[PDB]
Amino acid sequence: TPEEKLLRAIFGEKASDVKDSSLRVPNGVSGTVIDVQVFTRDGVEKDKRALEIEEMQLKQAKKDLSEELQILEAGLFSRIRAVLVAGGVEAEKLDKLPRD
Amino acid sequence: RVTVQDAVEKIGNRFDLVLVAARRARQMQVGGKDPLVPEENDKTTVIALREIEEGLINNQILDVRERQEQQEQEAAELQAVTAIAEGRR
Amino acid sequence: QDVVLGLYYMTRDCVNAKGEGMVLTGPKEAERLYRSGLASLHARVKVRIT
């Protein structure tokens, strides 16, 4: 409207092609953001959004493998040790050579 | 709550009092605070009701002031309005 | 509810062995004496109230 035209002209904001549709926090609510999940159509222009989270999940997963292999190693070798000692006792000898 | 029984006592049938007080309050918001009895507190509705309580307003008296207001509008223009009427024959 | 429980409690008959024979000097002085001491769960006391 002409009044709005004048207002914009006075303040020089220029009419934007796009309209604000952002998701906002509802009334009476508030707090701490503890997680975000993003899902993008396959082969979409994935940006920093789907890359940072991706890499983070990869690091968490990899650590989830390292810890399980740590428990598995210190879980099976500590059992094969008591088996190896019985008969062929090597106290000061076994705790030297590599685990593999 | 403020002397409501007395206010209704001043004008029977309750309802009618509600209509009247409403009209008076509309008078307060329409033109000027004016009026009388004068506590100047608790907005237009209660100013009108307190006015009615002291029988300051009253329906007939309000109607009379309105007719006099019609006479006041007659006052001024008058000969000029009649001039606007006489020019158009 | 509670209001009743209150009123009934403040106006209940009692042996009044403690707060017996009290001249009130009026409802005001009576209240003063009531808040003060020696009056509990009402008393058998004459009231000077006009």
Next chain:
Amino acid sequence: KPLVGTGMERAVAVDSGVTAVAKRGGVVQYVDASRIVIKVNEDEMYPGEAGIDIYNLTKYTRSNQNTCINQMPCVSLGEPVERGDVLADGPSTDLGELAL
């Protein structure tokens, strides 16, 4: 835990899978907010052919009614636990007893 119970508050917290329990007798190897590692065979050497078990704990998960479901470890490092012992308490549970 309620100071006045009926004695059923343990069985409720037990049968609902919120609380994490030990499968077999063993000893606690590791304790974390995130996970609890238990080394089996301490009592009656039940486990065979590789020994140990790792319980990942649910942490700050969201329920259907928007309440936060999180487990807290109820054990300490090196603690001896038997079969069916409470390891981590779920939401609204205290030492294996129901806390509403």
Next chain:
Amino acid sequence: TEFLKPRLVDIEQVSSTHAKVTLEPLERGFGHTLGNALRRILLSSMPGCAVTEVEIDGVLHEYSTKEGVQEDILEILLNLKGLAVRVQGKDEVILTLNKSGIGPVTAADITHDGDVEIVKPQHVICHLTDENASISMRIKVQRGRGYVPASTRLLVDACYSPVERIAYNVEAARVEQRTDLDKLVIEMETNGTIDPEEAIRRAATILAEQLEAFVILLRPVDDLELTVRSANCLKAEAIHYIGDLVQRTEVELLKTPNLGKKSLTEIKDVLASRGLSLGMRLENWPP
């Protein structure tokens, strides 16, 4: 640390000897505190003159009734309790009351003593019926504290305190941001011997005089949750903490071997997200 102290006052004079003064701002829990403290002082520790004994001619026991007097001795003592007297500087004074005739015998008929001041002379003490009736009595007035009944040890219940009734209301107060403020509304009922306000300042005086003898820059970059690449680049540039990063400028960072504009923009975003920025001066790095 300072507390909210009284501001703006109001006094609602219900009558000539009954007033309601209120303090507008108070902290929560002080309404009942000052209210009960003051009620306990006022109802027992106020100083005032009061009738304690009476010597009427011809009268022996309170159960007796006098010839020519409408009301019985009990009612007469009951009236004598309400005798409002202000004495100059004494703790005991004897008033003489001689009266003959028909009609009401008021406090104005009491023999005018120089020291003694009678607040309400129109206060009715008796009622003489016949014209041959007459009363002659000696009213003993003593100074004391609180309500001391005659049943202590003719005798009359002594109401030394000038105040008949005390009440208080806590009511949540308005005012600026605090919301949890109260305002103490004290309802006072005195006899007019002493002013309400000065009675309050006197209770406060007694109370006070009783209390006389008792008066992020050092956080690692890893906390920012940057990309692995950005973090490793920063660590490679000897930037291990937030403080190290906030000192660098965009230009200088772009001059480093491993940090591009995407990464720099990321850094600006994550820093802005925590109220921080690049090129921040802290002057004195480090203590």
Next chain:
Amino acid sequence: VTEFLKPRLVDIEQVSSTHAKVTLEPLERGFGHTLGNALRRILLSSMPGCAVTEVEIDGVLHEYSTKEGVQEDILEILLNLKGLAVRVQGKDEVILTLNKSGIGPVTAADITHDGDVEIVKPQHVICHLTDENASISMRIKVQRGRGYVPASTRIGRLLVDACYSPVERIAYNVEAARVEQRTDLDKLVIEMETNGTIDPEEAIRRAATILAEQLEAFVDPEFDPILLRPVDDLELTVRSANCLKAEAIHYIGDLVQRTEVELLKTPNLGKKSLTEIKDVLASRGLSLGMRLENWPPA
């Protein structure tokens, strides 16, 4: 006209480090409950004390996070920090540093010994590090205040509910005092159970002080607002903002008064910065060399 007997602290029976019994020797009958209630009411809510208000734990962003190598989650840790009893010399804000690596409990005794700060209960558990490669490094902010001020009463920094009041429980007894003189005298025995941050005597004198101070007698648009906004509201570059602040330009009103000539004469402002400033000012209907004549009103 009988002069009154005025109360004085006469006894202190320290049952323990945090439990005491303070008694007043002279009192008139009926005064026991008055001071008893007044003092209990002041003590239980109006006492000033130090309390943890903010905490900065490394690696942790939000309090709902859980840390690798720590038994309890961050919430439990903060909840533990609420109970950190600290006595600070003469300050209204102090930063405590806590660095700890190893296995076992991380108590208040592991907090870096600061000269001013006194730790009442060093054996107070804050954490439990499980594995020997685990370590925590946190910054605990301790402030002085009054009453209960929740964290909800408003950076990657956590907030903790503040429990400022040093007093947990108060009790009092009226008990008839001895002394042949007057005979009708009482003695107020206040049994206090505090957190050990503050001594009984000064607490009593402080409650009485507050009470006395409460009893302090009984007596009786023109111009554009945008000009008073800080320069940060212009959202300039860090360099331009710092330069302007260095030139005593802290608000938009200060900036709009300056001219191009004057600004270019400053030691740190180049053509780029000026272009930026003119651009951001023009973007909001403002400019340089603006006359507002009357700087400032009040």
Next chain:
Amino acid sequence: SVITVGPYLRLHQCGLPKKMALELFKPFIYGKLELRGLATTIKAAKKMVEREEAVVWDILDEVIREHPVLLNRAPTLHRLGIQAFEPVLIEGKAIQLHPLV
């Protein structure tokens, strides 16, 4: 909203939460802020009130002065199922109701 007892209330009064009152009386508040010099225009008043800027509250007190609200509870079996009360601004999210009613 949920109702709680209000013992301090007069029979002609009710406890009304600040936020609720702020929302309900919004156009009145804008109008009053335009009449007095508190805001240049209705839009400015809105922008100001949304922020919850101070003095908006005192203005709200000026708005509900002598004004009445209707309180209603289902089921409405008789005409006393809806009654009028003078609103008193209160902290908290609960409506406070007079015990006699």
Next chain:
Amino acid sequence: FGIDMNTDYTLEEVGKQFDVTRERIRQIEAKALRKLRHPSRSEVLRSFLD
């Protein structure tokens, strides 16, 4: 701006209407806009954006 006649007349049209050159009309348009935008009287018209 079309407040009059419901049409946004060109600078040349307005110039022709006032018997002046387009440069003149652009000049007075510019000083008018300048007056409007100025900090004085800017209030009210301002903030109406969001």
